[PDB]
């Protein structure tokens, strides 16, 4: 990335305090609620008729954990997101048909979830580093699209 040692340390340090289980479920659910059109990919999950129905849907929470899991692992290859997400990039394009703009929406949702959770701790400079990360991830994931 174009992350500063200081930017890398801030990312890394906050992440260490994250419950991926909880943040993953919340991030994905918020996505489905704020940007309802993203539900187009999760018809099989069930009832996403209400915020409550989305936030409570176990399938949402479980997919949320899977996605953040994968994200979490990419934070260890911050200097080669491209290579880390290559296979996932193909899958998303060729099998899932997910428009890369979704990656960007989630990224922003993720940042709102972190601010939500960390309050004070999530400072302007920490947000700035995360914004670089989420953009980086979105790009990596979109890289293999053709």
């Amino acid at each position: 990335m174009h992350l500063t040692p200081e930017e890398k340390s801030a990312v890394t340090a906050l992440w260490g305090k994250v419950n991926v289980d909880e943040v993953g479920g919340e991030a994905l659910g918020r996505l489905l609620v704020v940007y309802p059109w993203t539900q187009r990919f999760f018809e099989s999950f069930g009832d996403l008729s209400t915020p409550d129905a989305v936030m409570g849907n176990p399938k949402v929470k479980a997919h949320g954990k899977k996605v953040l899991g994968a994200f979490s692992d990419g934070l260890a290859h911050l200097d080669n997101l491209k290579g880390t997400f290559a296979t996932l990039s193909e899958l998303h394009c060729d099998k899932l048909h997910v428009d890369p703009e979704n990656f960007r929406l989630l990224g922003n949702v993720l940042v709102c979830v972190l601010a939500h959770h960390f309050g004070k701790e999530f400072t302007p400079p920490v947000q700035a580093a995360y914004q670089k990360v989420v953009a980086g991830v979105a790009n990596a994931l979109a890289h293999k699209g053709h």
Partner: protein, 141 residues
């Protein structure tokens, strides 16, 4: 909002399209597929090969919709309601893609109506596609 001038410009330029609307619609799609490959994610079920009948068929449908919006330039929200519903509830195309298609429609018109594609007309057509896009996205949330 579209001004009287804008409306005149659009009716004029679209007037020239005439019977080629269909072909220009198909061409705009193809340009879009080639330039902004991400848009292809919405047509996994289509044959996107050059001269695809699916693309031809779709190009016509889009062109008809635009022609209908021009015909009802003073009542677009109502003339496009049905299509607004479809995109919001079924298709659920991410809003950013409207700008991409809009752009490819402008390129197509430019490539075909050199005499009419004046700066003034270009500005009017851009405002118009923006308004159509806004209508089609209005019921998203």
């Amino acid at each position: 909002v579209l001004s009287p001038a804008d409306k005149t410009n659009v009716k004029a330029a679209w007037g020239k399209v005439g019977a080629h609307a269909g072909e220009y619609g198909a061409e705009a799609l193809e340009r879009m597929f080639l330039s902004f490959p991400t848009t292809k994610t919405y047509f996994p079920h289509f044959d996107l090969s050059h001269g695809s009948a699916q693309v031809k068929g779709h190009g016509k449908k889009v062109a008809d919709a635009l022609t209908n919006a021009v015909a009802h330039v003073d009542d677009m929200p109502n003339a496009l309601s049905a299509l607004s519903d479809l995109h919001a509830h079924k298709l659920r195309v991410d809003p950013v893609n409207f700008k991409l298609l809009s752009h490819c429609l402008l390129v197509t018109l430019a490539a075909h109506l050199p005499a009419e594609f004046t700066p003034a007309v270009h500005a009017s057509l851009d405002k118009f596609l923006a308004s159509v896009s806004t209508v089609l996205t209005s019921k998203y949330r």
